[PDB]
Structure formats: C-alpha cells, structure tokens
Ligand binder design. Structure first.
Ligand SMILES: CC(=O)N[C@@H]1[C@@H](O)[C@H](O[C@@H]2O[C@@H]([C@H](O)CO)[C@H](O)[C@H]2O)[C@@H](CO)O[C@@H]1O
Ligand SMILES: [Cl-]
Ligand SMILES: [Cl-]
Ligand SMILES: [Cl-]
Ligand SMILES: [Cl-]
Ligand SMILES: [Cl-]
Ligand SMILES: [Cl-]
Length: 129
C-alpha cells in the first residue's frame, strides 16, 4: 500500500506514535517519506546481507526475522514480512521499541540525514488531526 501523507499521519497517530519518546508526528511522517516513500511493501538489501522492510525500513540485523540474516537478532519478535502489511500496526509497535533503544530516531538513517533539524511540521500541514 502506498499511503497518502495525511493518511499515514492519521494512522500513525491512532497507533500512538505522535510524540512517542518526544518525537512529534511530523518526524515520523518525514522518516517514512524518505525511508520508503510511504510504500508499505518497500524492501532494501544492506551490504552486510540484512534487509530493511516496510514503511519505516526496519532492519533484519536487529529487529525482525527473515531467516536469511545469519547472526542477527529479532528484537521485535516478528517475521520481517509482517512489516510489509498494508496495516501499519507491526511497523509501529516495532518502531516504538527501536526509538526506545537509546539513540532515539537516529536509528533511521534517512531521518538523521533528511529530517533531523528541519521543519518537520510541514509533513502534517493541512492534515485533519
Ligand atoms: C531502524 C532501522 O532499522 N533503520 C534502518 C537502518 O538500519 C539501515 O542502515 C543500514 O544498517 C547498517 C547495517 O545493515 C546494520 O548494522 C548498514 O550499514 C546501514 O546502511 C537503513 C538503510 O537505508 O535503513 C533504516 O534507516
Ligand atoms: Cl508527499
Ligand atoms: Cl510535527
Ligand atoms: Cl536470520
Ligand atoms: Cl519468524
Ligand atoms: Cl494502518
Ligand atoms: Cl539518507
């Protein structure tokens, strides 16, 4: 599923991501924009053999099981395929664990490089929230 900008903002808010760990909704929407372009089915292969899955490009190195990342962890206790669903529940629940791990949203490369410090409220501008 390719979410609209305001559509994703509403879904993230319902699942309690807004202001989660102090990160405003615009931060989360911006992260999803640059990680996946709002596409729940996005996947990308990393140099080490791990893969990033879904709207927030969550990495199998630490967070989910795909059966093809030797030595990796599954800290969200989920199959990576669950992060590709049209329903964002699994991705949100895992994102909550990730952002609580110590380094906040810096875990998302695209957030650090393209969202951090910018006018992130622009991403929820005009949305009915
Ligand atoms: C929270 C999350 O999963 N973020 C991922 C990044 O982990 C991922 O960055 C890759 O992770 C490194 C190793 O694969 C794991 O140590 C790679 O060196 C690095 O490229 C990023 C890739 O675009 O996507 C999300 O931000
Ligand atoms: Cl957009
Ligand atoms: Cl915001
Ligand atoms: Cl594995
Ligand atoms: Cl599994
Ligand atoms: Cl949803
Ligand atoms: Cl980047």
């Amino acid at each position: 599923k390719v979410f609209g900008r305001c559509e994703l903002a509403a879904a993230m808010k319902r699942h309690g991501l807004d202001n989660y760990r102090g990160y405003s909704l615009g931060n989360w929407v911006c992260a999803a924009k640059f990680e996946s372009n709002f596409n729940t089915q996005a996947t990308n292969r990393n140099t080490d053999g791990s893969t990033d899955y879904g709207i927030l490009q969550i990495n199998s190195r630490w967070w989910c099981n795909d059966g093809r990342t030797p030595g990796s962890r599954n800290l969200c206790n989920i199959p990576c395929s669950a992060l590709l669903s049209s329903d964002i529940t699994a991705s949100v629940n895992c994102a909550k664990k990730i952002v609580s791990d110590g380094n906040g949203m810096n875990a998302w490369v695209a957030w650090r490089n393209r969202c951090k410090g910018t006018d992130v409220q622009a991403w929820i501008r005009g949305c009915r929230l």
